[PDB]
From a paper:
[name] (CedV) is a Henipavirus species isolated from the excreta of Pteropus bat colonies in Queensland, Australia. HNV-G proteins comprise a short N-terminal cytosolic region, single-pass transmembrane domain, oligomerization-mediating and fusion-activating stalk region, and C-terminal receptor-binding β-propeller domain. Binding of the HNV-G to cell surface receptors belonging to the ephrin ligand family initiates pH-independent activation of F, triggering a fusion cascade that results in the ultimate merger of viral and cellular membranes. In our integrated structural and functional analysis, we demonstrate that in addition to using the common HNV receptor, ephrin-B2, CedV uses ephrin-B1, a receptor with no precedent of HNV usage.
To assess the extent to which this sequence divergence is reflected at a structural level, we determined the crystal structure of the CedV-G receptor-binding domain to 2.78-Å resolution. Electron density permitted modelling of the entire receptor-binding domain of CedV-G included in the crystallized construct (residues K209–C622). The receptor-binding domain of CedV-G adopts the canonical six-bladed β-propeller fold used by known HNVs. Each of the six blades (β1–β6) comprise four antiparallel β-strands that assemble in a toroidal arrangement and form a central depression at the membrane-distal “top” surface of the molecule. Like the prototypic HNVs, the β2 and β3 blades are decorated with extended loops that form three short 310 helical segments (η1–η3) and three α-helices (α1–α3). Eight disulphide bonds stabilize the fold, seven of which are conserved amongst other HNV-G proteins, indicative of structural importance in stabilizing the β-propeller. The additional disulphide linkage in CedV-G (C310–C376) links blades β2 and β3 at the base of the molecule. The receptor-binding domain of CedV-G possesses eight N-linked glycosylation sequons, three more than the prototypic HNV-Gs. Electron density corresponding to an asparagine-linked N-acetylglucosamine moiety was observed at seven sites. Concomitant with genetic proximity, structure-based phylogenetic classification places CedV-G in a cluster of ephrin-tropic HNV-G proteins, closer to the Asiatic prototype viruses HeV-G and NiV-G than the African GhV-G.
Numbering used by the authors: 209 to 625
The structure:
């Protein structure tokens, strides 16, 4: 509980890159993209997609699933021990996957479909959803989720598991999900309170309603939510689909649930007009109400009319996924690898921040580095706070594309270099 908690320069994160976990592909044309990582109770689950001359998720043919353990090697730092590594049996039909580390095994929740455009012109009854689970010894097993016996809190027509990680609470799995609904049932009191220039075309009430529409169908709305899956031994499933609170709604986007410090932290990537950090601890579960933070310093780059630090409501789409991880509940401290650029996805920086001020930061690379998304997970190691982050990098514009894993420690004292 003793580490740097003040505004300072020159932090010593003791940063180290991990290279033996992520495989190295012999083919230079293959792009390894969209990594996911969830750590819990000393075990982790790593996932990434492989495609040919394209780094798009559904534009793939392989989906890697890795299980491992956190181990002390006497190195005075945590090490990743890879135990099992498998490819998803339905990879060529995977639309999205979310990892969950429960107890001492890996769990992968994937959405499989024949139609890459299923979210724009189809419904969830036309698709299938599976749980693939394994550990260091057991062979991987894939079970189909019975969405037929599912109960929903609203008239949803489609959904996909979308996010950087899930959570295990007792016998229930809670996975972040993005839902689709074809009628405007939503309110926007928070956005309507903004004091911005009125666009000559539409009103502020119209801007915020329409900003929840899909940019590829416009008759559909993308609303974030969670799915609660309880089971005994992959038997007698009870599945519930709850939407996120209508307080401070933002267009559907990949989220995250993480167990940290006795609370449950929810993160939602800001892919619409509110370019500041959407995150918060869970107050109620039905409806899924995270106590949204009022962060005024953490944002993300994007092209178009909503770049970094953009505040005003606007029909915008785009952004980057950047997980956060809490360090101290009383001091309201979090850590995150964010992108230090207004419009381009580049220059990742490890950032320890308040809701109101940035405490300290450090660039990951001295050279300019392209990075499309980051995820961060922190844990106690040797009675000290350590974190592991994965960055979706493209440093070799001439060699193959591959994500990178970094491990670092929160500085014990401020300003040591
Ligand atoms: C794709 O179509 C085939 C034939 O209709 C079907 O067997 C399969 O289950 C479909 N896949 C999904 C995810 O629905
Ligand atoms: C757009 O969504 C509506 C609502 O279900 C659907 O009927 C229509 O086919 C979709 N159009 C496209 C091009 O996906
Ligand atoms: C994980 O272990 C706990 C016991 O501490 C148990 O209650 C829970 O059902 C287990 N979860 C799974 C998915 O096996
Ligand atoms: C806009 O101004 C009003 C006061 O007229 C204020 O109450 C409100 O909080 C402001 N909007 C935002 C988003 O802060
Ligand atoms: C759970 O089911 C599997 C079969 O899929 C079986 O091998 C295993 O022993 C079962 N575990 C328990 C605790 O019943
Ligand atoms: C953010 O501000 C709102 C309005 O004052 C408040 O209700 C909410 O609790 C604040 N967030 C946190 C994390 O306290
Ligand atoms: C960070 O926020 C806390 C309130 O949670 C405040 O007391 C503190 O002054 C802030 N940090 C700095 C450097 O001012």
């Amino acid at each position: 509980k003793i580490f740097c908690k003040s505004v300072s320069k020159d932090p010593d994160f003791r940063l180290k890159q991990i290279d033996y976990v992520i495989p190295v592909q012999q083919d230079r044309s293959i792009c390894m993209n969209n990594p996911l990582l969830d750590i819990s109770d000393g075990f982790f689950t790593y996932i990434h997609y492989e495609g040919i001359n394209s780094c798009k998720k559904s534009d793939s043919f392989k989906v890697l699933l890795s299980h491992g353990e956190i181990v002390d090697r006497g190195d005075y730092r945590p090490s990743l021990y890879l135990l099992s590594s498998h490819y998803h049996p339905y990879s060529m039909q995977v639309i999205n996957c979310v990892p969950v580390t429960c107890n001492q095994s890996s769990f992968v929740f994937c959405h499989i479909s024949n139609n890459t455009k299923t979210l724009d012109n189809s419904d969830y009854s036309s698709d299938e959803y599976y749980i693939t689970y394994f550990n260091g010894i057991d062979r991987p097993k894939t079970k189909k989720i019975p969405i037929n016996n599912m109960t929903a809190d609203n008239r949803y027509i489609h959904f996909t598991f979308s996010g950087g990680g899930g959570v295990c609470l007792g016998e229930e799995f809670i996975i972040p999900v993005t839902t689709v609904i074809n009628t405007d049932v939503f309110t926007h009191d928070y956005c309507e309170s903004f004091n911005c220039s009125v666009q000559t075309g539409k009103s502020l009430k119209e801007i915020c309603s329409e900003s929840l529409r899909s940019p590829t169908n416009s008759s559909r709305y993308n609303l974030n939510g969670i799915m609660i899956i309880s089971q005994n031994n992959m038997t007698d499933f009870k599945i519930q689909l709850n939407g996120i609170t209508y307080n401070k709604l933002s267009f559907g986007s990949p989220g995250r649930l993480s167990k940290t410090l006795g609370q449950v932290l929810y993160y939602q990537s800001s892919m619409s007009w509110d370019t500041y950090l959407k995150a918060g601890f869970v107050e109620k579960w039905k409806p899924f109400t995270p106590n949204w933070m009022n962060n005024t310093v953490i944002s993300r780059p994007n092209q178009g009319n909503c770049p970094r630090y953009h505040k005003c409501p606007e029909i915008c789409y785009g952004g980057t996924y950047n997980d956060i991880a809490p360090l101290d509940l009383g001091k309201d401290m979090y850590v995150s690898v964010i992108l230090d650029s207004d419009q381009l996805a580049e220059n990742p920086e490890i950032t320890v921040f308040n809701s109101t001020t940035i405490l300290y930061k450090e660039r990951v690379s001295k050279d300019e580095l392209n990075t499309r998304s980051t995820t961060t997970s922190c844990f106690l190691f040797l009675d000290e706070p350590w974190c592991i982050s994965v960055l979706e990098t493209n440093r070799f514009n001439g060699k193959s594309i591959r994500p990178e894993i970094y491990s670092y420690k929160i500085p014990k004292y401020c300003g040591t270099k």
